[model samples]
Target: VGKVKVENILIVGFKTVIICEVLEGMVKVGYKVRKGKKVAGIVSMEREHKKVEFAIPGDKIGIMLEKNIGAEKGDILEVFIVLEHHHH
Candidate 1:
């Protein structure tokens, strides 16, 4: 999982976008965004005003979410990737 510090937020095209700095790990476009009990999917990502697929630590990035998760400035958002496991 990745962690990021939320710096700012915006509402564009009915999506909740957050500008954040990566704190730990890597965040990717298909990552899941979660804070507390609220959660959403990362629909897109950007860095340096251009679209990007992922962000590493210390990178400032813009993450567009599928829906609003009620995030705020100075909050930490968790980035997660779901992996399915099978039991034999």
Candidate 2:
């Protein structure tokens, strides 16, 4: 529903993962997330969904960003949860 910040970046071999700090709102595992000014990728994972904020501060999750964009640390990303255009 709002903007979230990319806490850190991890590069393993050729794969790149952008770790996002979830302060508020819900980020499910199958949700779609894009970058703010710089376009990125989807929400790969969401940690501690059922836990309290005090129990887990800045709940970290996995984001599979696009290889083309020059994504950096602490970049505010725009997340959008994709719904079925037409349900069966």
Candidate 3:
């Protein structure tokens, strides 16, 4: 059994954010992610036997979970890299 913890949760359209504590399961981090592309953060803050909650970042339009996809604690829900952009 794995214990999940949530750091933050933000809703873009509603302009609201929620911070949660430790939640109950083990979830594997999904591969559906992009850097600075406005994606949601899905987390599993709970045990596998219990229900897991997802923490999505604000500015995200929507989130969709596929079969056999999930997230774990300390896992990177979204994919991003530090890069510099030049403007002409």
Best by TM-score: 1
Task: Indicate the residue-level lDDT of 57 in model 3.
Answer: 28
Sliding window of 10 residues with minimal summed lDDT for model 1:
79-88
Report how far off residue 1 is in candidate 2 (Å): 2.2
Cα lDDT of model 3 by residue, 6-77, tens digit: 344445593333223323332233423322334443332333224444323232122333322233324334
Q: Write the per-residue lDDT of candidate 1 for residues 1-88, one digit (tens) a residue.
A: 6899999997778667799999999888878989999888888998998999988999999998888888899999888975536675
Give the local distance difference test score of model 1. Answer: 0.88
TM, every model: 0.85, 0.61, 0.20
Task: Write out the backbone clash pairs for model 1.
Answer: none
- Ranked candidates (lDDT, high to low): 1, 2, 3
Error of 2 at 31 (Å): 2.9
The reply for model 3, stretches above 4 Å from the true place, is 14-26, 29-88
TM-score of 2: 0.61
Q: Tell me the tens digit of each residue's lDDT in model 2 across 1-88.
A: 6456777777779767766676556655444556545554452553543322121235676556444355567776665565646766
Evaluated against the true structure, the overall lDDT of model 2 is: 0.56
Clash number for each model: 0, 0, 8
